[PDB]
Structure 1
Amino acid sequence: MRIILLGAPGAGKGTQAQFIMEKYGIPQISTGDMLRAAVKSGSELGKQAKDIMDAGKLVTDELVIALVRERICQEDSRNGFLLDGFPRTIPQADAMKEAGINVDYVLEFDVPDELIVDRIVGRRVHAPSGRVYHVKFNPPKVEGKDDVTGEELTTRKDDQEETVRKRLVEYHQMTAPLIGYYSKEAEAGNTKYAKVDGTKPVCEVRADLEKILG
């Protein structure tokens, strides 16, 4: 019902987020989507993240805490949710604690650092639809084209390999301690942890998730 997806950038969280959404009918709350949408439409609550997402840095904890707080207040609460990209720092995890939001599962998408850069530099997306591709690991039917609309695919500005390394460094510094954060909470019986082998093909990763959830 209420689960958190953890993992290094490019571990595959967003890909498996689409599957968990359809299989179990819980909404996907992705801070990356909401910010990129707020920037695209110039929405006051998020448009400020433009220059710093393109730089590969993290958004101020307060700005995403409020956007998540506003997004969770929209949905019907027992529909559940599927957090993808949040929490990303210890203060963001403490915000959910203070706000009385307990989770049922934490799913860790473990992937070696040696795959991270290649997964992200090879990523292409269809921005209007959110569809995600990889040149090698999950390619479109036609090169550079979107499978549904035929429009020329795009590469996100922060998917430049240099910005990726800035992101991978910042992930190890600010976001990786959430693995020990929520593993301690699982050991306290406040949630249920689960590590997932993110190196498998997407077919098997989606199978491993099915066995963990239901």
Structure 2
Amino acid sequence: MRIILLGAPGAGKGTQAQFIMEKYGIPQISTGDMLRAAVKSGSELGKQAKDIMDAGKLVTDELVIALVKERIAQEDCRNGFLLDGFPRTIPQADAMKEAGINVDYVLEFDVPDELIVDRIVGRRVHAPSGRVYHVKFNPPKVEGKDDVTGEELTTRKDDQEETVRKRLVEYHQMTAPLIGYYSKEAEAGNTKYAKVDGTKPVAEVRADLEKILG
């Protein structure tokens, strides 16, 4: 199974990706995480990016597209994967068609602008695993600590309010057209498309997805 998750930053994509990956065995492919990690190591594809992310602007299409192509060439993706943050522009989506990468499901998280900032300002991550927390809406069991390793959680550098607003503008300009893009792909039968209410609590969004994916 191959899945794309669409939605504003802070819509809940990464959070729900973890559950999908655990129930259905397909890895999460999060270009944001890959970029943030490639930034960290600085010895692989996608090293050039910290200044662009930190502005809240998208990395250039070709770079990301390659990074994903290499990432899905790994043996763990061969039976399925979950794209989370990719494609993020019409060129990235067209490059998937160009490369012969079909998708079985596109899952749209509906979450209004007015909820996005509180979500992202309170976000805490465990980078090594991708686990995502929210200090209030989905907290670690122990404040400040990853549930599994006990490692102290971090804040992403792009999770500041000012930056989050510019990201949202950028999102509505370059990435929201993907909604219509994959709706048209679904009307033509080339994918299954579904819209979920991403304002519900985490466990309810989780249950709504379970009911779509069987």
Q: After TM superposition, is the score higher than 0.5?
A: yes
SS at match of 2:132: strand
Aligned to 1:203: 203
Contact residue 27 and residue 79 of structure 1 kept, 8 A: no
Match of 1:35 in 2: 35
Provide the TM-score with structure 1 as the length reference: 0.96
In structure 2, C-alpha distance between the alignment counterparts of 1:22 and 1:146, rounded to whole Å: 17
Structure 2 counterpart of 1:89: 89
The structural deviation recorded for 1:145 is 2.8
- Give structure 1 stretches of 5+ with no counterpart: none
Q: Give the distance between the partners of 1:30 and 1:213, measured in 2 at CA.
A: 20
Q: How big is the shift at 1:129?
A: 3.0
In 2, distance between residues paired with 1:91 and 1:155?
A: 30
Paired residues in the alignment total 214
Deviation at 1:48, TM superposition (A): 0.5
Aligned equivalents of 1:156 and 1:18: distance in 2? 18
Bigger shift: 133-142 or 5-14?
A: 133-142
Indicate the larger mover: 25-34 or 89-98.
25-34
Tell me the CA shift for residue 101 of structure 1: 1.1
How far off is 1:100 after superposition? 1.1
1:143 positional shift? 2.5
Describe the SS at the equivalent of 1:102: coil
Residue range with higher mean Cα deviation, 149-158 or 88-97:
149-158
Contact 2:107 2:196 in 1 (8 A): yes
Gaps of 5+ in 2: none
Query: How many Å apart are 1:78 and its aligned residue?
Result: 4.3
Q: Which runs of 4+ in 1 moved over 4 A?
A: none
| Maintained 8 Å contact 1:90/1:175 | yes
State the shift of 1:146 in Å. 2.8
Distance change (3 Å), C-alpha of 1:164 and 1:179: same
User: 1:44-73, CA deviations, whole angstroms, 9 ceiling, x for partnerless residues?
Assistant: 311101111111110000000000111111
Q: State the TM-score, normalizing by the size of structure 2.
A: 0.96
Cα distance in 2, alignment partners of residues 22 and 152 from structure 1: 23
In the superposition, relative to structure 1, how do residues 145 and 77 fare at CA in structure 2: closer, same or farther (>3 Å)? closer
Q: Percent identity?
A: 98
1:131 to partner: Cα distance: 2.0
- How many angstroms apart in 2 are the aligned matches of 1:77 and 1:161? 35
